[PDB]
Amino acid sequence: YEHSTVMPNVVGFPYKAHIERPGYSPLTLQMQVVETSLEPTLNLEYITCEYKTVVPSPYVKCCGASECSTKEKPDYQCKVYTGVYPFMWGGAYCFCDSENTQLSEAYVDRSDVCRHDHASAYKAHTASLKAKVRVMYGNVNQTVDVYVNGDHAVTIGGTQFIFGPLSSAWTPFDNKIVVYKDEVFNQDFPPYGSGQPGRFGDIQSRTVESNDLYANTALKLARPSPGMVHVPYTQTPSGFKYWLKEKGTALNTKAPFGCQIKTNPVRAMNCAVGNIPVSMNLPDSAFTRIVEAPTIIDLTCTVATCTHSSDFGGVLTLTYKTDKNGDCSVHSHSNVATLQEATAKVKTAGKVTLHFSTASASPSFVVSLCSARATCSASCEPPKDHIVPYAASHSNVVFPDMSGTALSWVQKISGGLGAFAIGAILVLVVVTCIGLRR
Amino acid sequence: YEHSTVMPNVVGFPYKAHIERPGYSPLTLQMQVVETSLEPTLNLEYITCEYKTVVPSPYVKCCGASECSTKEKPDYQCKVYTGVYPFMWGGAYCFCDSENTQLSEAYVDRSDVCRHDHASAYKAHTASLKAKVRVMYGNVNQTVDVYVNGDHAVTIGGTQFIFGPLSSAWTPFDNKIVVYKDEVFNQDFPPYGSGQPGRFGDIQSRTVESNDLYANTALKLARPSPGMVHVPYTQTPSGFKYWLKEKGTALNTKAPFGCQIKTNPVRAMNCAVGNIPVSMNLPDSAFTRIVEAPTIIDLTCTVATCTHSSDFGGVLTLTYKTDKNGDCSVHSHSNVATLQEATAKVKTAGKVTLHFSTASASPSFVVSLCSARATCSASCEPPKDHIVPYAASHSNVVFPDMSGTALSWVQKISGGLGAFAIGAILVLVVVTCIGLRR
Amino acid sequence: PVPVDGMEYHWGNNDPVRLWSQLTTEGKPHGWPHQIVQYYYGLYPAATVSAV
Numbered sequence: 001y002e003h004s005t006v007m008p009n010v011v012g013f014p015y016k017a018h019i020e021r022p023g024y025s026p027l028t029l030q031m032q033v034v035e036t037s038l039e040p041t042l043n044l045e046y047i048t049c050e051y052k053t054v055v056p057s058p059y060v061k062c063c064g065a066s067e068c069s070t071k072e073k074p075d076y077q078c079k080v081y082t083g084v085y086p087f088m089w090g091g092a093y094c095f096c097d098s099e100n101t102q103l104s105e106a107y108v109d110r111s112d113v114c115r116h117d118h119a120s121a122y123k124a125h126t127a128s129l130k131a132k133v134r135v136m137y138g139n140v141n142q143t144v145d146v147y148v149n150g151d152h153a154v155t156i157g158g159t160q161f162i163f164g165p166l167s168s169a170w171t172p173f174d175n176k177i178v179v180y181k182d183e184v185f186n187q188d189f190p191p192y193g194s195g196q197p198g199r200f201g202d203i204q205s206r207t208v209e210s211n212d213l214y215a216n217t218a219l220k221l222a223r224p225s226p227g228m229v230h231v232p233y234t235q236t237p238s239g240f241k242y243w244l245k246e247k248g249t250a251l252n253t254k255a256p257f258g259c260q261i262k263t264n265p266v267r268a269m270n271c272a273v274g275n276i277p278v279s280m281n282l283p284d285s286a287f288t289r290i291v292e293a294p295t296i297i298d299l300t301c302t303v304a305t306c307t308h309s310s311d312f313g314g315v316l317t318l319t320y321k322t323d324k325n326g327d328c329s330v331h332s333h334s335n336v337a338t339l340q341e342a343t344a345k346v347k348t349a350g351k352v353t354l355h356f357s358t359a360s361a362s363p364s365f366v367v368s369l370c371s372a373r374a375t376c377s378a379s380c381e382p383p384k385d386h387i388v389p390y391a392a393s394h395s396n397v398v399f400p401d402m403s404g405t406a407l408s409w410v411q412k413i414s415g416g417l418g419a420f421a422i423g424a425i426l427v428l429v430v431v432t433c434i435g436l437r438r
Numbered sequence: 439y440e441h442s443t444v445m446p447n448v449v450g451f452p453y454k455a456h457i458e459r460p461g462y463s464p465l466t467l468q469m470q471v472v473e474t475s476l477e478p479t480l481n482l483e484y485i486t487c488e489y490k491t492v493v494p495s496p497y498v499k500c501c502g503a504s505e506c507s508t509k510e511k512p513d514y515q516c517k518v519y520t521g522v523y524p525f526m527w528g529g530a531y532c533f534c535d536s537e538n539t540q541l542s543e544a545y546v547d548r549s550d551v552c553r554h555d556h557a558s559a560y561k562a563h564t565a566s567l568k569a570k571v572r573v574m575y576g577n578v579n580q581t582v583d584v585y586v587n588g589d590h591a592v593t594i595g596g597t598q599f600i601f602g603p604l605s606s607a608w609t610p611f612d613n614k615i616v617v618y619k620d621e622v623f624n625q626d627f628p629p630y631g632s633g634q635p636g637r638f639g640d641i642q643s644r645t646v647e648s649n650d651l652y653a654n655t656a657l658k659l660a661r662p663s664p665g666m667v668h669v670p671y672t673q674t675p676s677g678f679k680y681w682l683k684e685k686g687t688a689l690n691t692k693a694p695f696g697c698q699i700k701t702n703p704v705r706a707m708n709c710a711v712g713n714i715p716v717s718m719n720l721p722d723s724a725f726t727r728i729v730e731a732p733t734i735i736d737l738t739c740t741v742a743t744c745t746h747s748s749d750f751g752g753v754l755t756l757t758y759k760t761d762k763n764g765d766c767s768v769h770s771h772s773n774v775a776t777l778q779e780a781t782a783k784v785k786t787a788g789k790v791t792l793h794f795s796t797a798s799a800s801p802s803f804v805v806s807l808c809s810a811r812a813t814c815s816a817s818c819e820p821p822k823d824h825i826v827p828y829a830a831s832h833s834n835v836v837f838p839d840m841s842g843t844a845l846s847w848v849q850k851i852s853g854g855l856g857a858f859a860i861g862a863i864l865v866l867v868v869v870t871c872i873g874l875r876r
Numbered sequence: 877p878v879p880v881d882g883m884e885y886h887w888g889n890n891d892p893v894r895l896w897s898q899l900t901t902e903g904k905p906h907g908w909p910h911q912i913v914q915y916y917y918g919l920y921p922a923a924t925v926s927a928v
């Protein structure tokens with residue numbers, strides 16, 4: 001038997017679906033979302049880490065000159081300084097008084113730990129939602145891992161389940177992303193081959209193990225001071241270390257809809273938005289023949305107490321009379337009130353009690369025990385507590401019933417004014433018809 | 439000096455760009471696309487292959503009954519049959535005349551070479567373009583590997599290029615793809631866990647190494663024939679084998695725009711569609727000061743021969759007079775005609791010959807040598823060969839010049855009719871004015 | 877602030893904590909008509925005025 005429903009994408013909300021097959025007693029099965037995960041598809045642009053400047057010993061040629069030789073090294077700098085006269089601890093070498101020369105070289109490289117401490121720059125698109133759902137009905141109670149798209153069918157107790165695509169296409173990750181350790185930054189980074197000194201990305205590499213490197217750190221050589229050997233230089237400090245101090249916030253602490261950002265792999269979890277369509281295919285052994293199901297007549301519903309709090313703050317009593325003792329399946333045909341359970345024990349004594357949660361001043365909903373029906377209406381009082389550590393068990397429906405006190409009063413007033421208008425219309429009609437008849 | 443232009447996305451086309459700095463002599467860059475590859479992003483859905491039915495030896499109990507034991511195997515089947523009297527080569531065992539049983543068992547498994555011969559079901563989206571571009575100006579070639587998006591800057595001889603995003607967002611891949619060896623098929627496969635017997639995907643596995651397997655092959659058992667031990671069964675033949683001979687065409691033999699489909703990684707090669715913007719940032723060493731460039735004055739253009747064919751079928755002779763001899767940058771300022779070469783060796787004799795290709799009956803285009811300009815008009819005759827083995831070397835512009843023979847005839851005839859109309863209007867105005875003045 | 881949607885605070889190394897607000901107000905429903913308006917003004921205090 002095929003059935004289709006829609007359940008809210010809320011973790012911990014007890015969804016209950018009511019199946020009413022023509023030949024069998026009604027069935028109520030409970031579905032709950034234990035967990036959720038939403039992962040974008042990432043393709044790596046480059047990585048960044050702190051650099052390291054390589055400065056070899058200067059070549060001081062005495063009594064002669066040297067020539068600078070170009071090399072294919074990242075941000076390579078080389079210059080030749082003439083007229084040097086260095087000293088060392090024992091004396092001054094370069095016997096020639098002023099026909100000497102020094103060669104200074106410097107380049108940059110990735111730091112020795114770039115495979116341990118680095119940041120990845122990604123582009124994110126087309127997230128896929130996975131879920132973990134517990135389904136329970138009859139003697140079946142079991143939890144499954146599913147892909148939330150119309151392209152994954154699972155079997156639970158012989159029943160086939162397909163959890164269709166999510167209602168909305170909202171994702172918290174925008175086009176460009178930067179990942180550092182276990183923190184995701186919702187950032188726009190410079191293109192590859194176009195990094196700037198002192199900012200994020202002043203050195204860029206396609207992969208951790210890649211061999212070529214791009215570097216732009218404004219490294220510049222300077223003339224050595226007279227009488228000493230040292231190779232001076234100036235270089236703008238690392239842009240990775242500057243990002244580490246001026247990165248700003250994170251997506252972990254900003255994300256809407258209250259969802260946790262995890263890394264490795266990058267994902268957003270328990271992120272309450274949208275609805276999940278569900279398609280079902282049940283066997284005939286899930287139901288019960290309407291013969292051995294109990295027969296209930298004269299179903300009366302009276303509300304004992306009500307207070308529209310987050311938990312199950314209303315109590316409900318049903319009176320009936322039955323021919324045989326057995327089990328029935330209760331259900332509330334409105335989302336104004338959410339019931340605690342999906343099954344009751346019927347006995348010849350004729351009294352069952354059950355708990356419901358609502359959020360409106362005066363609810364009115366129809367409840368059904370096996371095949372019977374009844375209408376329940378109540379007047380509920382506000383709670384006194386201001387703040388609670390748990391989420392609502394209701395659907396946040398507030399608009400009151402037409403028989404409730406507020407709308408009853410409005411109905412009385414509007415009816416009085418309408419009667420006044422109708423009477424005046426009749427008076428004018430009679431007078432104008434008399435005027436016409438003359 | 440930053441400059442910006444656009445290129446056709448056709449392989450082998452000789453694009454020529456003209457840069458005209460106010461303080462310098464003009465420059466001409468030549469760019470070609472040597473190769474492209476359009477890469478989709480894939481999500482593996484599952485793996486399909488031929489199955490293997492495993493059937494253990496049967497169990498026969500003499501004066502006993504065997505109780506059927508269930509277990510968790512893919513598409514597992516077990517039965518017990520009563521009253522067997524098997525015979526073997528030496529005779530019939532089971533003294534027990536009738537009250538003895540046989541237990542039949544069978545299940546499905548992934549085949550021994552599924553690691554080597556399988557088909558993969560993918561979801562494809564968000565393709566990325568990558569190219570090899572040959573850039574030449576002054577005294578260098580080079581070919582560079584570029585990601586064709588606005589986020590890759592590559593330096594050639596001191597000039598850095600960004601090849602902008604392709605104008606179109608066209609891809610030859612649908613949402614769902616099936617890859618087999620070296621072929622790609624645009625095909626909708628069944629959802630995982632919902633494959634049907636005898637068709638593609640009767641057995642599904644989430645990955646080659648995955649331990650779990652879905653099998654729906656309609657395996658059934660039957661009673662053994664009397665006096666015999668053989669475990670019969672009937673079971674629908676494989677769906678991977680069935681698909682292999684009934685898949686139908688491919689994408690390799692079908693794709694629009696003439697692009698080659700290749701695999702691992704799956705990509706579309708040389709797939710001529712759209713336009714690509716390019717932005718450059720040239721140094722000052724690229725240009726030549728206007729003082730060094732020869733001064734060209736009194737420039738005229740005359741065409742010797744035309745044939746608006748695919749290759750370079752038009753010849754152009756160009757006259758001038760110069761004060762020194764050197765190099766000029768020639769350019770054709772309309773896409774109605776395409777010049778073969780980018781620089782001309784200018785001498786004091788006063789003649790340069792240029793080769794151009796067009797597809798219009800009467801081209802008209804302005805060409806510049808160094809800094810001079812001239813307008814070239816030609817009357818070109820159609821080819822004789824019907825079919826050629828090379829691509830067109832023009833831009834397929836056909837509308838003629840307004841001074842061509844056909845448009846000249848149209849212009850004369852329309853002018854005559856307009857003169858008749860103007861005379862009619864004037865005479866009517868004159869007569870109406872005379873009558874009104876009465 | 878703690879709206880009806882909830883709020884989350886993280887303080888130090890220990891785990892973040894969530895809090896939700898209840899539909900609490902100061903009037904009394906099912907009373908005189910000038911108290912029902914007070915009830916519906918305590919919660920949603922911007923559409924009640926327009927509707928009245």
Ligand SMILES: *[C@@H]1O[C@H](CO)[C@@H](O[C@@H]2O[C@H](CO)[C@@H](O[C@@H]3O[C@H](CO)[C@@H](O)[C@H](O)[C@@H]3O)[C@H](O)[C@H]2NC(C)=O)[C@H](O)[C@H]1NC(C)=O
Binds near residue numbers: 063064065095096
């Ligand atoms: C021992 O010390 C003497 C002290 O001068 C060194 O003599 C110097 O030797 C170099 C050899 O490279 C001479 O350089 C050459 O000088 C000429 C003329 O200036 C120049 O045109 C060449 O290009 C080259 O650089 C240098 O002039 C000379 N000094 C003098 C003659 O006063 C000698 O080399 C030392 N012996 C060693 C290091 O084995």
Ligand SMILES: *[C@@H]1O[C@H](CO)[C@@H](O[C@@H]2O[C@H](CO)[C@@H](O[C@@H]3O[C@H](CO)[C@@H](O)[C@H](O)[C@@H]3O)[C@H](O)[C@H]2NC(C)=O)[C@H](O)[C@H]1NC(C)=O
Binds near residue numbers: 136141142143
């Ligand atoms: C349907 O099946 C699930 C399990 O598949 C049942 O979950 C059960 O939940 C209860 C509490 O809701 C768990 O009991 C708890 O055990 C911890 C152990 O430290 C104890 O400290 C708690 O005070 C509480 O007693 C129970 O372990 C868990 N069952 C499992 C994990 O197998 C669920 O209750 C079932 N539904 C129904 C209606 O029975």
Ligand SMILES: *[C@@H]1O[C@H](CO)[C@@H](O[C@@H]2O[C@H](CO)[C@@H](O[C@@H]3O[C@H](CO)[C@@H](O)[C@H](O)[C@@H]3O)[C@H](O)[C@H]2NC(C)=O)[C@H](O)[C@H]1NC(C)=O
Binds near residue numbers: 501533534
């Ligand atoms: C040697 O061969 C003899 C056959 O002549 C086997 O004896 C047979 O054993 C089975 C099982 O004990 C007997 O089945 C039983 O039947 C009675 C009804 O009389 C029933 O109450 C039991 O529950 C069971 O079904 C079978 O009757 C019996 N055959 C005869 C003729 O009595 C014997 O088992 C063989 N020995 C070995 C070691 O296999």
Ligand SMILES: *[C@@H]1O[C@H](CO)[C@@H](O[C@@H]2O[C@H](CO)[C@@H](O[C@@H]3O[C@H](CO)[C@@H](O)[C@H](O)[C@@H]3O)[C@H](O)[C@H]2NC(C)=O)[C@H](O)[C@H]1NC(C)=O
Binds near residue numbers: 579580
């Ligand atoms: C730009 O630089 C490239 C780098 O070499 C040049 O490519 C090569 O050009 C030579 C011609 O000098 C080609 O060799 C010839 O190829 C023809 C093809 O039919 C063959 O018949 C000849 O025997 C000879 O081998 C060579 O194939 C070509 N290489 C590639 C990869 O295209 C190019 O010529 C330079 N362009 C200019 C305008 O300077």
